[PDB]
Amino acid sequence: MVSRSMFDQLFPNRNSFYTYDAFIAAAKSFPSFGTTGDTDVRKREIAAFFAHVSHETSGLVYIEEINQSNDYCDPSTQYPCAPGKQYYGRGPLQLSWNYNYGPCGDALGLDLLNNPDLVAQDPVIAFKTALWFWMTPQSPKPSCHDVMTGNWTPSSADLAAGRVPGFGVTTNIINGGLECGKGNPAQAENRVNYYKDFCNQLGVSPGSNLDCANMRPFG
């Protein structure tokens, strides 16, 4: 794991909300994060997670999505929207939509469906929501964790679609419908730029298959 001082090197401008101790506590909740594979692989995973976080929150400066005009409610019997609440982006990976706050809360033992603001109020919970997304396979997508740590077996369909192991597939999992394939490559390039910078700081290679312009979104 990166030291306290390295966390400050990687996130020099972050809001004080996002403490190293809160990150470490959240990570203890997901003990395979950053501890799977050889030490270079562990650093690539950490760098990849932090690169997406840095993209989504401008270096852990932001906690909440700026535009709060939209409730991000897709009516659901399984994950019903709470009256008066909104599911706009919160936390390091900008958890969004009732149908993600629901399962995320269930995984963390929290009622995030009815108290979605909690993700922007408790930093351990904030980091746990991001690690939940990173660590959890959600069919048909593997977890970003498994992709980066050599534990994902792409299907034959994945290979034919260009979904090969590396950072690019993580962008695809996170937002490939808009950022990969024929999409405008600007946002994916920003993610890769953070990733390459963080890998350089940690002394490892970014590895192969970084871009996602040559892959289709998952089904």
Residue numbers in the entry: 0 to 218
Report text from the authors:
GH19 chitinase hydrolyzes the glycosidic bonds of chitin, namely beta-1, 4-linked N-acetyl-D-glucosamine. One of the physiological roles of chitinase is to defend plants against pathogenic fungi by degrading chitin, a major component of the cell wall of many fungi. By revealing the evolutionary history and loops appearance of GH19 chitinase, we discover that one loop which is remote from the catalytic site, is necessary to acquire the new antifungal activity. We demonstrate that this remote loop directly accesses the fungal cell wall, and surprisingly, it needs to adopt a defined structure supported by long-range intramolecular interactions to perform its function.
After we confirmed that the tree topology did not change based on the presence/absence of loop regions in the MSA, we used the tree based on the unmodified MSA and selected five ancestral nodes where InDels of the loop regions occurred, designated Anc1 to Anc5 based on the presence/absence of loop regions in the extant sequences. To get structural insights into the emergence of antifungal activity in GH19 chitinase, we first solved the X-ray crystal structure of Anc4 and Anc5. Crystal structures of Anc4 and Anc5 solved to 1.13 Å and 1.57 Å, respectively. Overall, the backbone structures of Anc4 and Anc5 were nearly identical (RMSD of Cα = 0.478 Å) and the orientation of catalytic residues is similar, suggesting that loop I and II addition/removal did not cause major structural disruptions. All five ancestral proteins showed a similar level of chitinase activity to the two modern GH19 chitinases, while Anc5 also exhibited antifungal activity. Insertion of loop I to Anc4 resulted in a loss of catalytic activity of Anc4. The loss of the hydrolytic activity in Anc4 via loop I insertion might be due to the lack of disulfide bonding between loop I and the core scaffold. However, it is worth noting that the addition of loop II to Anc4 did not improve its antifungal activity. Anc4 and 5 differ by 45 substitutions, suggesting that loop II enhances antifungal activity in combination with residues in the protein scaffold. By fluorescence microscope experiments, we observed that only Anc5 and Anc5ΔLoop I bound to the surface of fungal hyphae. This result is consistent with the result that Anc5 and Anc5ΔLoop I showed 28-fold stronger antifungal activity than Anc4, suggesting that the acquisition of loop II is necessary to access the substrate in the cell wall of fungi to perform antifungal activity.
